[PDB]
Design a protein around this ligand. Structure first.
Ligand SMILES: [Zn+2]
Ligand SMILES: [Zn+2]
Lengths: 72, 195, 930, 195
RNA sequence: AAAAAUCUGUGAUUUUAAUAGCUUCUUAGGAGA
RNA sequence: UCUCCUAAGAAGCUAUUAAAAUCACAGAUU
């Protein structure tokens, strides 16, 4: 189950980079910190919280229309 | 299939040679005709060195070229739809992770409460939410505390779309804002902070 | 106990004392010595039994006794030596001599009382700072505490600060040591004064460090023999040669600096256009090292051979910490182009070597060809001279200019996710809870500032001296390893380029790659190289980030050395490089193949011949950043030693100033700014691996010489090494020109035991354990001590291993574990990677194209070749790491064949003509050829 | 295949043999002349084959020479282009050397030589300064004028990492730059200018 | 905008060596017109 | 005086296998 988070975080970071988050020199550093902490950890308890923190930023950058599809 | 006929003629020549050599038991002394048959069969066989070689080379070249074309046509199609592919992959992966936390977060996001989309998120201790309707407001907040994610946040200031700033209502239990929902317009912008 | 003896020892000093011995009996203490006589030789640590010691005490203002460090030592000797020392002290009464006092306490006891000596002499300080181990460190803490070198000291300070001994993790370290500078400066000056006094009074004898009390006063005269007044021969050949590294580890000569620098307010007023400091290094040398009995040429132009060059560069490295930093680098001159003035180089001024002037000079140019235009453009002297000044406080390195485009930030990208294989692996059961193959080796991004944050790690490179005697003998022994290789210069037509489509550095990279610049007619490449032997051609260097799988989170960088460097360094070095690559069964492993039964040959050749073997290994923390400059120069000279006939000495000096100006002191161009590289090897420089290997051999030989010199030769059981050790000290210190008849003997001893296997930075050695137990060979703890003062790093034991049981093979060499498996009915070693790396190089890919599995089928065929030996592994969870790859290649081929039918074609011939998804193709890659 | 002259001779020999073997049947088999005709045809075929092989082997030399000359032409063209580009770059970077300052910098030199590191320090008029932290800005900027070494500088602009621009805030004593806010991304690249 | 080297696979061109075969001149052995 | 078969030398042409060299792509290590 840990590998699932460690593999979802990389694709999430790829999506955020494709969304042109590198323009901000403050948000990018915080996101990189979260991503590195998720990758370098072992306890899924911390990885899940850090992944949720990363995901909170996704809505702010771009209100993805697909937000209503994952529910079902 | 154009190469098979050469194989058929070679086999026919070999069979004829076998038949003539088996029937011609006297060929041991009269080996002239036996040698002639052997040489004719050999000439029939020799066609392979040319026909099979050319066929194999041409087929290999054509297959290489066509495979390269197919690989290019596949990689270009893969690259054509990058961002939508990334979204689909991310959602398919999130579906795999069984965690009620992310499900609750996504349900709340679909409800109508999301970051303000401006003043980008920069720290782990601040947010800015929008609460569309009184129903989700009552569902989420409780007096001074709100729970957007699994964590509990503390409210600092509340603003209305017109810019007027709201204030809490005195009550024995504690500060409250619910009554103001039915008397003021929507939506409300709430500046949170980590607890 | 007796009180009369103490009362007499008190003398007229009028000071309080407390006995340490139980009476007239002597006292036993552990002190370092420097002995060389008809029976022993070395820098050993032996017990002292000839002297009784009393401690002075004083009354503090608070009314409590303070146990000051002033000691009274009362040595006891025979009447003959008593009279001899009395007569000697009749002279040499100057202020630099500790106040003696001669008396006889009883009819049979003779005393030579020395008053107010400090506890530890100079030799104890030098020895403790040299042979440093973090579990017997009292001799150094008791010196640092007393002389107030830790300003915030409070009881049990060392308990809270657990990493006070780490040069690269305690930012205050060097600022903690620098407060010892005055003591060493005083020691040197008092040594010179005492030498002059001895010469005047006419005494011939040997002076060493243990003679000098820490206050700086000499305190015993047993060995001196009188001679005619006005004619004396003091010898300090081993006083200076042992403390040489500590004069620059503690910044002894700081009060001599010619400039005052504040990190925020810049240099104070000083002479800005003076470059020739040749007339001041000589004065400093005569002021401090007056009794050094060898010549010293400030400029390395005049040096006679590649040994005097090292000897003088060692001094220049110390004396160049005082010259202002805005005075080194390229010189320049004013010339004209059709009447339009501009700047062009006219020499070079290097920290380690000295001033060199070009042998050709011109003051006009027109119709310039391609070679001259390239020389002008690539030379920084015209770019740095026409751009805005730069001052950035992010880095400690000097910053000389900023390009027109300004400073710009560059980031790194994350790695893609190859789900098409992750799902298959999960279906096969690779990833499950409690697995023995956790995921590691991810793709790590970096923020904006990484480009310079990583380059800032050059602050670990500091100017370090070497003790020239030991370093020179170690160089002579090391050069014996490279005695069976070809060497020389080759013409242009014979050069060979591995790959031609690669960047040509700055600014050439704008117009094309190396292919475009290699089209120059050979008559022009030859002219360029020949004119490099009579000129100095400085060039710019880029610093570009790297992007590859890595477990460590830190970033990486590689230097893109410009084409004007490689184009000539290839012609210079390629012959010996290709001779190193085409040799087998030698300490240098570069060029040997891991497949086809090569690994077993290397391992069974390393182990053969050594009695009672016990392998080991070592790791250099930050080798690229922290490599001292003098060792890089030594490696370059060791590789250039083979030009006996093709080049004269002067050309071999100009070539070394070209290598130094192009690699060791680059004008780095990192992130829109031009800096000055302090030192250390650049990864992208030509012949980096071979220079690293030579440096490794030098370090491994020093780690053995130092340990072999520091043992009590009186108590060596073996009668063959008991004489080799005695001869080694005399051959190293008490002689000027090395003796090959002994260098060969010592190299034979060092190759019979302590075998070696080296590849750039990696290494392994199987050393005779019985000797290493007695201290006659450099075991693991014998490398940390040498790295402490020859590399300025602490080699933590967590980075080293030891494998006494040979049958299990090396723990890890070249990042591949070794295992023993029967092949063809005999036991042979096989390598096998870390399965996490193989498993996590298929899931993550560095480009979007590679995520399409069908298009890169060859990636898994090349990955399954290297992961085969995991089939023999006992752990059942590692065989899947290979069978899954086989099944995946089968699946890829089947999918491609089925999918290609949409084009109305059948690939059945090639499909069934594939042997790659079977075990036979790979199993034959680890079997010795017939 | 028919281009080589020997093919015509081979065809002529074939025709002659075919005609003679049929014309000589009047006298019977006549092995004496039949063997001579066979040998003549055999020699003709051997000579034709040898000449064809020699010509085919010699053919490739023309293609090799054409490739060589084409490569030479392309390499000389690329060399010309590269030389033009290098000349343009050199004459572009050499156009902004103020001869006036260079005429005084070398006046004070030790025999007309000055280390390269001190050309921009005595000739330039703008200092690009980079500040990575407020703890350094407070200790370096010193209001609006930055003093480095001995000279006194001014400030022309202040640019942050994002690429935006900070602006001064007027006060009673004079202009100042607002620092230590949470909305400025470090480092700050300050472009000074000599007084 | 992506450095200096070593090793190993796959595909394309050329030469060499061997195997099999074809055509030809010569010599030698067996016999035939 | 000529002809068939057989052995060898030599010349040319076909293919199959193995090695070397050049060119292109891809992995691993320092
Ligand atoms: Zn010298
Ligand atoms: Zn040479």
């Amino acid at each position: 189950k840990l590998s699932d988070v460690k593999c979802t975080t990389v694709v999430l970071m790829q999506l955020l980079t494709k969304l042109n988050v590198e323009a901000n020199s403050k948000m990018h550093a915080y996101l990189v910190e979260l991503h590195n902490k998720i990758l370098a950890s072992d306890d899924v308890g911390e990885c899940m919280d850090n992944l949720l923190g990363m995901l909170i930023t996704l809505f702010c950058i771009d209100s993805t229309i697909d937000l209503g599809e994952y529910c079902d | 299939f154009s190469h098979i006929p050469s194989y058929a003629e070679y086999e026919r020549a070999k069979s004829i040679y076998e038949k003539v050599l088996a029937d011609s038991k006297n060929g041991g002394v009269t080996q002239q005709e036996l040698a002639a048959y052997r040489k004719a069969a050999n000439i029939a066989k020799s066609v392979f060195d040319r026909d099979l070689a050319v066929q194999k080379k041409l087929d290999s070249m054509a297959e290489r070229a066509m495979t390269t074309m197919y690989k290019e046509a596949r990689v270009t199609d893969r690259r054509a739809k990058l961002v939508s592919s990334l979204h689909a992959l991310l959602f398919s992966m999130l579906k795999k992770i069984d965690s009620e936390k992310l499900n609750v977060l996504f349900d709340q996001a679909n409800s109508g409460v999301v970051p303000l989309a401006t003043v980008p998120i920069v720290c782990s201790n601040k947010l800015t939410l929008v609460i569309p309707d009184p129903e989700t407001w009552v569902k989420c907040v409780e007096g001074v505390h709100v729970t957007y994610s699994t964590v509990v946040w503390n409210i600092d200031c509340v603003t209305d779309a017109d810019g007027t700033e709201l204030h809490p209502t005195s009550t024995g239990s504690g500060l409250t804002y619910c009554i103001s929902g039915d008397n003021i317009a929507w939506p409300l912008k709430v500046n949170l902070t980590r607890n | 106990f007796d009180k009369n003896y103490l009362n007499r020892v008190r003398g007229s000093s009028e000071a309080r004392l407390i006995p340490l011995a139980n009476g007239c009996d002597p006292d036993v203490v552990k002190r370092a010595f420097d002995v060389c006589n008809k029976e022993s030789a070395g820098m050993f640590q032996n017990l002292k039994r000839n002297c009784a010691r009393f401690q002075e005490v004083r009354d503090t203002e608070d009314g409590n006794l303070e146990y000051c460090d002033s000691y009274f030592v009362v040595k006891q000797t025979t009447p003959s030596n008593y009279e001899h020392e009395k007569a000697c002290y009749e002279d040499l009464k100057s202020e630099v001599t500790a106040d003696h006092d001669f008396f006889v306490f009883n009819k049979n006891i003779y005393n030579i009382s020395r008053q107010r000596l400090t506890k530890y002499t100079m030799m104890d300080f030098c020895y403790a700072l040299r042979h440093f181990d973090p579990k017997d460190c009292e001799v150094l803490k008791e010196i640092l505490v007393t002389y107030g070198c830790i300003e915030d000291y409070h009881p049990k300070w060392f308990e809270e600060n657990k990493d006070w001994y780490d040069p690269i993790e305690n930012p205050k370290y060097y600022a903690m040591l620098a407060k010892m500078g005055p003591i060493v400066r005083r020691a040197l000056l008092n040594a010179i004064e005492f030498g002059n006094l001895m010469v005047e009074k006419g005494y011939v004898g040997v002076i060493t460090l243990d003679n000098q009390d820490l206050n700086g006063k000499f305190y015993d005269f047993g060995d001196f023999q009188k001679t005619a007044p006005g004619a004396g021969v003091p010898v300090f050949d081993t006083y200076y040669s042992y403390m040489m590294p500590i004069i620059a580890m503690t910044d002894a000569l700081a009060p001599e600096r010619y400039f005052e620098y504040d990190v925020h307010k810049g240099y104070k007023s000083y002479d800005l256009l003076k470059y020739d400091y040749t007339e001041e290094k000589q004065d400093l040398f005569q002021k401090y090292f007056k009794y050094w009995d060898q010549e010293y040429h400030p400029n390395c132009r005049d040096c006679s051979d590649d040994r005097c060059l090292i000897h003088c560069a060692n001094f220049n490295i110390l004396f160049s910490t005082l010259v202002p930093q805005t005075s080194f680098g390229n010189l320049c001159r004013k010339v004209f182009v059709d009447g339009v003035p501009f700047i062009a180089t006219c020499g070079y001024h290097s920290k380690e070597l000295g001033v060199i002037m070009n042998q050709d000079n011109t003051m006009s140019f027109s119709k310039m060809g391609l070679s001259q235009l390239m020389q002008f453009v690539g030379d920084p002297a015209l770019l740095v001279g026409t751009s805005n000044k730069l001052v950035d406080l992010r880095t400690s390195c000097f910053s000389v200019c900023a390009l027109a485009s300004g400073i710009t930030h560059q980031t790194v990208k994350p790695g893609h996710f190859n789900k098409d294989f992750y799902d298959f692996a999960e279906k096969a059961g690779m990833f499950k809870e409690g697995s023995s193959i956790p995921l590691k080796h991810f793709f790590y991004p970096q923020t904006g500032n990484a480009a310079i944050n990583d380059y800032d790690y050059y602050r670990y490179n500091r100017p370090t001296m070497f003790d020239i005697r030991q370093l020179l003998f170690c160089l002579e022994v090391t050069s014996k390893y490279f005695e069976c290789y070809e060497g020389g210069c080759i013409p242009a037509s014979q050069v060979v380029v591995n790959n031609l489509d690669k960047s040509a550095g700055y600014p050439f990279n704008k117009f094309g790659k190396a292919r475009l610049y290699y089209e120059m007619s050979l008559e022009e490449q030859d002219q360029l190289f020949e004119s490099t032997k009579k000129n100095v051609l400085p060039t710019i260097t880029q610093m570009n980030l790297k992007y590859a799988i890595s477990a460590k989170n830190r970033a990486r960088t590689v230097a893109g050395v410009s084409i004007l460097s490689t184009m000539t360094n290839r012609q210079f070095h390629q012959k010996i490089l290709k001779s190193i690559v085409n040799t087998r069964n030698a300490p240098v492993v570069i060029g040997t193949t891991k497949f086809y039964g090569g690994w077993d040959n290397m391992l069974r050749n390393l182990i053969q011949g050594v009695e009672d073997p016990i392998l080991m290994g070592w790791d250099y923390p930050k080798c690229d950043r922290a490599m001292p400059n003098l060792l890089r120069i030594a490696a370059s000279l060791v590789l250039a030693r083979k030009h006996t006939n093709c080049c004269t000495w002067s050309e071999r000096v100009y070539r070394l100033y070209n290598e130094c100006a192009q690699v060791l002191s680059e004008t780095v161009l990192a992130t829109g700014g031009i800096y000055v590289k302090p030192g250390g090897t650049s990864s992208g420089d030509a012949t980096t691996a071979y220079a690293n290997s030579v440096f490794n051999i030098i370090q491994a030989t020093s780690a053995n010489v130092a340990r072999l010199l520091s043992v009590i030769t009186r108590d060596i059981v073996y009668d063959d090494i008991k004489s080799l050790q005695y001869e080694l000290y005399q051959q190293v210190y008490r002689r000027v020109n090395f003796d090959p008849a002994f260098v060969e003997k010592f190299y034979s001893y060092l190759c019979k035991n302590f075998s070696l296997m080296i590849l750039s930075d990696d290494g392994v050695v199987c050393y005779n354990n019985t000797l290493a137990k007695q201290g006659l060979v450099a075991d693991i703890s014998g490398f940390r001590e040498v790295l402490y003062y020859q590399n300025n790093v602490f080699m933590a034991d967590s980075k080293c291993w030891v494998e006494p049981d040979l049958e299990k093979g090396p723990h890890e060499f070249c990042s591949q574990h070794t295992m023993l498996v029967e092949v063809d009915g005999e036991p042979r070693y096989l390598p096998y990677p870390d399965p996490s790396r193989i498993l996590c190089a298929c899931v993550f890919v560095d480009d979007l194209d590679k995520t399409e599995s069908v298009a890169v089928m060859e990636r898994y065929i090349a990955l399954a070749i290297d992961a085969y030996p995991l089939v023999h592994h006992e752990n059942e969870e590692y065989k899947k790491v290979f069978f899954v790859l086989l099944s995946y290649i089968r699946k890829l081929y089947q999918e491609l064949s089925q999918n290609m039918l949409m084009d109305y074609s059948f690939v059945m011939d090639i499909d069934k003509g594939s042997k790659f998804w079977e075990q036979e193709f790979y199993e034959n890659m680890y079997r010795a050829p017939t």
